């Protein structure tokens, strides 16, 4: 029977007695006065003991670290010189009337709060006492608040929380499936889903107008930092809706969520085309906090003596883009070399530059080794175009389109953060209008997303010139990171056959790879479209956490194993035999 939470002791409850249960954080013994810091889910509070009731003192001297205790006392208003900023309840104390030790505790491996030098492996191995730390708990509770808000919104807007099975059928092409040996069907396997995509589409076929699900997803790929094998995703699919409606509902959701939890507001989300994003940022996930923008200038540098510019300037398969960084002419050559080496890692042969100091003197007003091979007029209209003035530096990326886009895009974000050139507000956005196809190294055409993505044009303008086709696909970006995305699917016979014809796939593969899907599609599928969010990263952003493991209760390391439960582990030969499988760890000479 608890009266109040430790970390919810405001100043208003003065003159009231309270009973609070929790753990013993740290204990201070002064002899004449004993201090206890009791901690629960809401935070820490201080309880003070004077030996005027020396029995409680006897029940105060034995108490050690992390003891689970229940204390009843009165909240006394602490002196002005004793107030604590770090403690949220740190302007009041509680004098302990009676104490009881609910349970004893062995010494906690590691200490809570810094600079206790825990290392990540030890923190993961004893994760059950690590989550006692108020910061981790705040992160997880925040996650709970997020899922709460999202569920409330989606429920209120007529979506149905329906569960889809995890054990499904394995198939290649997309990614490595986690397999599950079948006890009842020897030689056959179940497979963990990569996304409830197919199932949600079936649910659209099934007549359910609006579907949502917070589902578990599994990928057997080698992983990146901020990447885990088991990750949670917010799946959403709707019927009889176009892209505007879907983006509307979803955007509204994100705003309402950010205002419910963090209490921030987002105005409106600008819709930016893929083409524009690639043009002025060189990335499909632009960081709209950094105002710095890439500006194309290769057209006026075609017939020029300097050859690393003119080369790609006359080559259609690439461009020459410039990047103005303001007030950064004072930058030292060391940093310049560092940046050249940085853009080096994305394939750029070189990072050309111009330090712009005095515009009215022309060429002797532009200190740089490149200025000699380029005419004064072109220079001046370039400087005019990029928006540069006195005191600035202009960088130059001149190569194949992909390379310059990536290298200058990254140089953009890097020098963006390094010089603190951003507004510290939240900056959300939508990326729309992707291309339909791309070349696949060897040749030919292929769909980037899925062959089921709706093109903006008709199957005739499509079979005309497939390269001019834009897709009805959409990704949502926040702080330059991709929160998620989806698209409206094709339900048209002649259209599905059009994209099928244009990709080189005959009916053999159509049947072998997508037969059951096409089957389900043939029996009367409605206009439907969807999107999915990576819930983990969303919570990671909303918390301000460094890694994704910080927003997952019991995460796994980069090699897919978790050190706490020592999984994966070994299994006895019996269970191995009953599942119709064999090992192959045989002794060699």
């Amino acid at each position: 029977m608890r009266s109040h939470y430790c970390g919810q002791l405001n100043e208003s409850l003065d003159g009231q007695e309270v009973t609070l249960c929790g753990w013993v954080h740290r204990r201070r013994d002064h002899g004449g006065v004993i201090f206890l810091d009791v901690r629960d889910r809401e935070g820490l509070a201080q309880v003070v003991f004077d030996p005027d009731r020396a029995e409680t003192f006897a029940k105060a001297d034995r108490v050690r670290s992390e003891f689970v205790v229940k204390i009843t006392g009165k909240v006394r208003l602490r002196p002005e010189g004793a107030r604590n900023p770090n403690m949220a309840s740190g302007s009041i104390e509680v004098l302990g009337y009676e104490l009881e030790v609910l349970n004893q505790a062995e010494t906690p491996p590691f200490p809570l709060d810094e600079y206790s030098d825990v290392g990540e492996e030890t923190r993961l191995r004893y994760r059950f006492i690590d989550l006692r730390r108020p910061e981790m708990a705040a992160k997880l509770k925040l996650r709970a608040r997020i899922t709460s808000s999202i569920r409330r919104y989606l429920d209120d807007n007529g979506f149905l929380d329906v569960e889809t099975p995890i054990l499904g059928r394995p198939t290649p092409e997309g990614a490595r499936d986690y397999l599950v040996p079948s006890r009842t069907y020897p030689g056959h396997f179940f497979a963990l889903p990569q996304s409830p995509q197919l199932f949600k589409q079936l649910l659209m076929v099934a007549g359910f107008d609006r579907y949502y699900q917070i589902a578990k997803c599994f990928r057997d790929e080698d992983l990146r930092a901020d990447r885990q094998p088991e990750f949670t995703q917010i799946d959403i699919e709707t019927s009889f809706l176009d892209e505007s409606d879907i983006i509307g509902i979803t955007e509204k959701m994100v705003r309402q969520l950010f205002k419910e939890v963090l209490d921030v507001e987002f105005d409106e989300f600008p819709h930016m085309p893929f083409e524009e994003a690639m043009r002025r940022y060189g990335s499909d996930k632009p960081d709209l906090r950094i105002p710095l923008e890439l500006v194309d200038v290769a057209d006026q540098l075609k017939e020029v003596e300097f050859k690393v510019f003119s080369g790609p300037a006359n080559d259609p398969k690439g461009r020459v883009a410039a990047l103005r960084v303001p007030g950064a002419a004072s930058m030292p050559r060391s940093q310049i070399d560092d940046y050249t080496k940085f853009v080096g890692i994305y394939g750029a042969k070189g990072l050309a530059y111009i330090k712009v100091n005095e515009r009215a003197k022309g060429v002797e007003g532009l200190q740089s080794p490149i200025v000699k091979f380029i005419p004064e007029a072109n220079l001046n209209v370039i400087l005019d175009r990029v928006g540069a003035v006195d005191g600035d530096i202009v960088f130059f990326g001149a190569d194949k389109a992909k390379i310059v886009c990536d290298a200058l895009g990254a140089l953009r974000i890097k020098v963006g953060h390094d010089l603190k050139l951003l507004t510290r507000e939240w900056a959300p956005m939508w990326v729309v209008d992707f291309p339909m196809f791309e070349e696949n190294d060897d040749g030919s055409l292929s769909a980037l997303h899925h062959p089921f993505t709706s093109p903006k044009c008709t199957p005739a303008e499509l079979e005309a010139n497939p390269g001019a086709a834009l897709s009805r696909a959409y990704d949502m970006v926040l702080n330059g990171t991709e929160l998620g995305g989806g698209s409206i699917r094709i339900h048209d016979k002649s259209m599905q056959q059009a994209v099928f014809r244009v990709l080189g796939i005959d009916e053999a593969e159509q049947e072998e790879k997508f037969g059951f899907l096409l089957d389900a599609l043939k029996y009367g599928a409605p206009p439907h479209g969807g999107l999915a969010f990576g819930l983990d990263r969303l919570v990671m952003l909303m918390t301000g956490a460094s890694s994704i493991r910080e927003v997952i209760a019991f995460p796994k390391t980069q090699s897919a194993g978790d050190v706490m439960t020592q999984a994966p582990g070994s299994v006895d030969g019996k269970a191995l035999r009953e599942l119709h499988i064999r090992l192959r760890e045989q002794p060699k000479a």
């Binding site: 194949k400 192959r584 045989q586 060699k588 000479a589």
Partner: protein, 456 residues
Amino acid sequence: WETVIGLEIHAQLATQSKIFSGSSTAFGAAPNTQASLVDLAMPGTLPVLNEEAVRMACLFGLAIDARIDRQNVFARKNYFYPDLPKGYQTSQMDHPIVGKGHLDITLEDGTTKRIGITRAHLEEDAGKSLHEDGMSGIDLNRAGTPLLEIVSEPDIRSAKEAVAYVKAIHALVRYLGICDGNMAEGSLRCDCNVSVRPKGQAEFGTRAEIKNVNSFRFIEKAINHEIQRQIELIEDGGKVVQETRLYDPNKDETRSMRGKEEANDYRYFPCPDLLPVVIEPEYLAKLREQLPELPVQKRERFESQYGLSAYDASVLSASREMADYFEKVQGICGDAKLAANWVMVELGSLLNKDGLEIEQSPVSAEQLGGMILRIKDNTISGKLAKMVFEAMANGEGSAXXXXXXXXXXXXXXXXXXXXXXXXXXXXXXXXXXXXXXXXXXXXXXXXXXXXXXXXX
């Protein structure tokens, strides 16, 4: 299961000029700077065989105890690839330089097994392709570089044995001074012809040729992971196909670069430009006199005549320079075990400090020889070693009490540190001898007993 493997080792000979060209061998980042007209296969140009190339060839032939042919003819290996300029690789089809030899490889399972080498002929290297823009870039700096293809008889079995053979080849070549041996720079390379078979049936699994294998660890792991793969393949039956596989140390998996659809017809025939080189028994008579002492037999010579253990003999015979350097000090008459001892531990530390390629640089054998000379005859053995060890090796080059006095030193030490209180428990009494040794340097053997008697 019985695993029969083979090894095709390409060794880069350390010659100044190329085998048929006049360009240098060792090269830097500068591309096409080490290529004259001959290497570029210009029309009308002609090749001329290198002297020290064939010299080192028949040298390796003599070292490996192989029947060397009196005559050897260079043949053409016609295949088309951008790295190969003239469209054919000047190798040797019939009558190689050296043929049918044997190498004694020392392993850790007792017996030092004998392995066979079917041949070891002279080849030529080609260009290198690089990751760049688009198109690609071919550099002919290593093209025209003389190569020695040591092909081993398929007598080699287990993977550990294979590693032993690669190490033995590496050691022998290092001793002969033919190749650098440094696999990191890309001098010594090898391929493995692994094929497994169930004991009892003359039928067996398909042959697997794993090409481009760097380190010894890579060799072992790849050969194992290929053997087990073939075992599974024959157990299941399936399709046993002959393929050209590769190994990446990152995933420890074997991937097939090219599937061998058919036997590559390289169209071998005697080269009309190169006349058959005749190696007469006089060449071999002089070169055999020039032949250095084999390491495998050197550690055994360190076992037989000089009192030594297998370990110390092997690690001392790890290189010719160290071996000679040590043998000189032994020539001083410094005790075998103790002289070798001084070679191993003491100077070895400073040798680890710089890791100087040749021990001819840091310390002369006459100096350490002089030290042991002072330790044996001029002075008694003990503390005199300890200080001279510090002073003599590093800087200056210039070359003992046993009384009762140490007792007078033993009391004051007890007064320095609070050692009177630490006497209660046995533990370790080295700290007591420390102060006395530092105050004197004298006579540790007497000091240990005296301190032990004085403690409790």
